[PDB]
């Protein structure tokens, strides 16, 4: 596996008109999938990282914005990274995106980490344009290979025993931090239960306790649930993505939780900015912003 060559051809289009494709060989991509899939398994399903590190939310196929994102916070291993899932789908270039990410996960397995968003699942991959991208540029078989790689992704990360991170949010079933570690991989993302909720759930100001989720899957939780949880596990923050926010970062439960969204103009239907959370060794968090375009 010629990792450096791959990364090279990928970074090469850096600032060269919007949407210039980078076509690796399907054999190179399988390499990325299988050799990273190895890493994901040998590593814990519930990661334990340490500052400093930059954190990012949904990228959703917007590859050139992922470039600006590194261009702004520093390409690895300059900065440590945690990504909160939702790498493919909707965007124009899911293939380049997920490849560059799986590549860095292999190059710097210890300074680069990836969690699993709800869109890292064949149930919605097929629908929202990732399976289509594969089918168009490569073949069905290859997509079937990604979903074997995604099925082995980490679900959550706990930075410095203070920040708890996952794509969606909390769950009525998440009472023991071990319930997460007991989750066996590889695994599909279910309709109900802990794993599902961890990737689907949402914060809601108007909700008290556990309410129905407008998504038609999982629940919504309120500011009480947040505090009662941060207190049961001695955590000071919850960092998650999953939801578009105007500024790129947005607070909830009075800064007891933050929402990160790294893809500016989620579909060209938002004019929202993208954010990324810088966390120095002292746990002093700042929000580098990737403005859209006016």
């Amino acid at each position: 596996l010629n990792l450096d060559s791959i990364i090279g051809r990928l970074l090469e289009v850096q600032g060269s008109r919007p949407g210039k494709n980078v076509q690796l060989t399907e054999n190179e991509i399988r390499g990325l999938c299988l050799k990273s899939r190895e890493i994901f398994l040998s590593q814990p399903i519930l990661l334990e990282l340490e500052a400093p590190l930059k954190i990012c939310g949904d990228i959703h196929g917007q590859y050139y914005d992922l470039l600006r994102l590194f261009e702004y916070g520093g390409f690895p291993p300059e900065s440590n990274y945690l990504f909160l899932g939702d790498y493919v789908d909707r965007g124009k270039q899911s293939l380049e995106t997920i490849c560059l990410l799986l590549a860095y996960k292999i190059k710097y397995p210890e300074n680069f980490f990836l969690l699993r968003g709800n869109h890292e699942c064949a149930s919605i991959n097929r629908i929202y344009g990732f399976y289509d991208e594969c089918k168009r540029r490569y073949n069905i078989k290859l997509w079937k290979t990604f979903t074997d790689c995604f099925n082995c992704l980490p679900i959550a990360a706990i930075v410095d025993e203070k920040i708890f991170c996952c794509h969606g949010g909390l769950s009525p079933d998440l009472q023991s931090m071990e319930q997460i570690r007991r989750i066996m991989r590889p695994t599909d993302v279910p309709d109900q239960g802990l794993l599902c909720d961890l990737l689907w759930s949402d914060p809601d100001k108007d909700v008290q306790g556990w309410g129905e989720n407008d998504r038609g899957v999982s629940f919504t939780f309120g500011a009480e649930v947040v505090a009662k949880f941060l207190h049961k596990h001695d955590l000071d923050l919850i960092c998650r993505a999953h939801q578009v926010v105007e500024d790129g970062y947005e607070f909830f439960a009075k800064r007891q939780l933050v929402t990160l969204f790294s893809a500016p103009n989620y579909c060209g239907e938002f004019d929202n900015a993208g954010a990324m959370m810088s966390v120095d060794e002292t746990l002093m968090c700042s929000f580098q912003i990737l403005k859209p375009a006016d």
Partner: peptide, 7 residues
């Protein structure tokens, strides 16, 4: 050396 946030 603990958790707080910028502006």
């Amino acid at each position: 050396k603990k958790l707080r946030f910028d502006i």
